[PDB]
Design a protein around this ligand. Structure first.
Ligand SMILES: CCCCCCCCCCCCCCCCCC(=O)O
Ligand SMILES: [Fe+3]
Ligand SMILES: [Fe+3]
Length: 222
């Protein structure tokens, strides 16, 4: 059953979830612009992807305002810090495959799962905004898949390392958000299932085989 969007219980949980989504979208904008420094010939396309993320950020900010919720931005900045630090380390080292696995694969799959899971339990205003964001996230996943597919033979080992290092951070993020997501009437098992399907499908598209993907998804056990 649909949550009571007006309750103090719902608004409290929404203040943290809404802040996480707003921060995630800002970091996604910043990440695609940063990847433009590593792929100078991709700048115009990366600018278009980054502009989409800012449109998403604005839409999710309006979701919070619509419910009379003040987003807990400090909570959201801490939530992304471990993954943000790994993206910044990779960026500084010029490690384009790791930057793309973090943003274009892991984060886009986590957003797709979160948005798909939220849609059926969302208020009417946020439902339309969320439905209107999901198609773009598939475009972002496709962009990352395409580059990694084209460059797989040169970056195989780096991707296995990036997955080993960062997939457990996504799992920790899922563990951390689960309580508030349950107040929002979202089941953690649906979040995990949708995320693993999106991520496993992206890896298949890139060119990893069933054994490789199984070994990769098992990195979440750390
Ligand atoms: C505010 C309404 C949206 C709420 C959706 C449910 C969110 C629950 C889990 C939060 C996951 C954060 C995903 C990070 C966003 C990544 C953005 C992107 O790369 O485009
Ligand atoms: Fe987005
Ligand atoms: Fe995105």
């Amino acid at each position: 059953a649909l949550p009571d969007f007006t309750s103090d219980r719902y608004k409290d949980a929404y203040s943290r979830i809404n802040a996480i989504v707003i921060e995630g979208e800002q970091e996604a904008h910043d990440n695609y612009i940063a990847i433009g420094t590593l792929l100078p010939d991709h700048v115009e396309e990366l600018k278009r992807l980054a502009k989409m993320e800012m449109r998403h950020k604005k839409g999710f900010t309006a979701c919070g305002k619509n419910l009379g919720v003040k987003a807990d931005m400090d909570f959201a900045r801490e939530f992304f810090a471990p993954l943000r630090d790994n993206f910044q380390t990779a960026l500084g080292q010029g490690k384009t495959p790791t930057c793309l696995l973090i943003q274009a694969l892991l984060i886009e799959a986590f957003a797709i799962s979160a948005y798909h899971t939220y849609i059926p339990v969302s208020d009417p205003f946020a439902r339309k905004i969320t439905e209107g964001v999901v198609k773009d996230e598939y475009t972002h996943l496709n962009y990352g898949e395409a580059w990694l597919k084209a460059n797989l033979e040169s970056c195989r080992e780096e991707l296995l390392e990036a997955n080993r290092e960062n997939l457990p951070l996504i799992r920790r993020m899922l563990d951390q958000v689960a309580g508030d997501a349950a107040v929002l009437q979202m089941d953690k098992e649906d979040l995990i299932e949708d995320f693993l399907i999106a991520y496993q499908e992206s890896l298949t598209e890139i060119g990893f085989n069933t054994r490789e993907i199984t070994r990769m998804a098992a990195a979440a056990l750390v």
